[PDB]
Paper text:
In this study, we first determined the co-crystal structures of [name] with GSH (to 1.51 Å), and with S-methyl GSH (hereafter [name], to 1.58 Å). The binding poses of both GSH and [name] differ from that observed in the prior low-resolution structure of [name] and density for the amide bonds are consistent with their expected planar configuration. [name] residues Arg4 and Lys317 form hydrogen bonds with the Gly-derived portion of GSH, His274 engages the Cys-derived amide carbonyl, and His323, Arg364, Asp367, and Glu374 make hydrogen bonds with the Glu-derived terminus of GSH. The same interactions are present in the structure of [name] bound to [name]. Attempts to prevent the reaction in the crystal by using [name] during co-crystallization did not result in a ternary complex, likely because the methyl group on [name] prevents peptide binding.
Residue numbers in the entry: 0 to 399
The structure:
């Protein structure tokens, strides 16, 4: 039923001849293709700026609101170096800081997004007082919601991302590692406890849930949590990596549909969603990181299968967005490219970019927030700009 959710892929798969128009033998984009990306970015930015005039004033979040637009502009500033982009980011940061709701802790859906993005913007504008004030507030946020879930949009790893985002952008340990360590400990303890209570232990030493479901994917589920627990940034011990995380990863691997896709929740029989939030485009990160950490070929094999599912069924009728759209799906190819150095996957990303360059010409659904980072145009623009330098590309607000 995946076919019903996708457009047929109109593109030929990789060969040397077809790839030459997009990038050279070193994987560096051609000037021509680079400029075509740049031209579309400028075109879409105009539409986005106009569209955001109608966006909800109250939503300051990374996922659907102002801080996510600031994330885009910070990225464009880094890519292009145009000071006007940094100024745009400032405007959006200011809007976002007037929208704190005190209800959530995450980068994507909570107050950590505005605060972490603001800290970085202020730093980039040489505003030490405001940068430091934002960091203080961000650190303190780790109190307003204990017994949170563990997942990306509403839970502990979503807060961890905000901390990592500051540290990466300052290039120094602005948030002490000990802060990250203690959250990591809570996550691991939570997983062991739930697995024990539900007698998963033998097959899966860790287990997590959100909204009373065992979500499997990146946004709300196991694949996102395990991707994080396997990151050197989180400093999980070798002992816990092998005894707790690896067998829990293997359990997720075992949930794979015959197609190579993954169910949204444990026990789901319908093979339908090919999204970052649910399915192969989000689970692929766990597989790739598992390969990097454990070096077992099965993980790489599974990642290849993810890429094939996405190549076939990844041009979504849903639209061009990151959370569940063609641009988010294209990032799966970039992560596999960056692991393998196989230009086939850079090519696939470029062809998905070609699709996005025809934005609005396919009869896609209009997103609920048509201009947002995760549902809308800002995310598509983010992807196009990130593709300019493929080796540095990372799925925003998620990939490390
Ligand atoms: C965490 S996002 C989950 C996502 N939700 C949507 O696609 C809803 C539409 C969204 N609000 C938009 O406007 O893009 C989804 O997978 N929906 C289930 C489905 O497509 O059947
Ligand atoms: Zn989604």
């Amino acid at each position: 039923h995946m076919a019903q959710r996708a457009f047929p892929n109109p593109y030929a798969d990789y060969n040397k001849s077809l790839a030459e128009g997009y990038f050279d033998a070193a994987g560096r984009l051609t000037p021509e293709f680079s400029q075509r990306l740049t031209n579309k970015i400028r075109e879409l930015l105009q539409q986005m700026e106009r569209g955001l005039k109608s966006a909800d004033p109250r939503d300051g979040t990374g996922y659907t609101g102002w801080a996510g637009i600031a994330v885009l502009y910070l990225h464009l500033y880094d890519v292009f170096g145009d000071p006007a982009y940094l100024q745009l980011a400032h405007g959006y940061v200011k809007q976002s800081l007037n929208c704190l709701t005190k209800r959530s802790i995450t980068f994507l859906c909570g107050d950590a997004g505005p605060l972490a993005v603001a800290a970085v913007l202020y730093h980039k504008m040489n505003n030490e007082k405001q940068a430091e004030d934002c960091i203080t507030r961000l650190i303190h946020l780790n109190k307003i919601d204990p017994h949170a879930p563990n997942e990306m949009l509403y839970g502990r790893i979503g807060y961890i991302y905000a901390l990592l985002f500051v540290n990466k952008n300052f290039g120094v340990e602005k948030i002490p590692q000990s802060h990250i360590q203690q959250i990591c400990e809570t996550i691991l303890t939570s997983g062991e406890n739930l697995a024990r209570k539900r007698n998963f232990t033998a097959k899966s030493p860790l287990m997590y849930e959100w909204y009373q479901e065992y979500y499997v994917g990146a946004a709300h589920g196991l694949a996102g949590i395990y991707y994080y627990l396997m990151q050197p940034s989180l400093q999980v011990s070798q002992g816990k990596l092998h005894s707790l995380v690896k067998p829990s990863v293997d359990y997720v691997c075992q949930l794979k549909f015959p197609s190579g896709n993954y169910p949204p929740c444990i026990g789901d029989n319908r093979d339908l969603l090919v999204h970052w939030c649910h399915g192969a485009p989000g689970v692929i990160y766990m597989l790739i990181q598992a390969y990097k950490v454990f070096r077992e070929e099965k993980y790489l094999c599974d990642a290849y299968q993810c890429a094939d599912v996405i190549w076939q069924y990844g041009l979504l009728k849903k639209g061009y967005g990151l959370c569940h759209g063609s641009a988010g799906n294209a990032y799966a190819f970039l992560t596999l490219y960056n692991l393998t150095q196989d230009m086939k996957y850079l090519y696939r990303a470029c062809k998905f970019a070609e699709w996005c360059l025809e934005y609005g010409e396919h009869g896609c659904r209009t997103p609920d927030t048509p201009f947002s980072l995760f549902e809308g145009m800002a995310g598509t623009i983010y992807f196009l700009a990130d593709l300019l330098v493929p080796t540095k590309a990372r799925f925003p607000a998620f990939e490390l």
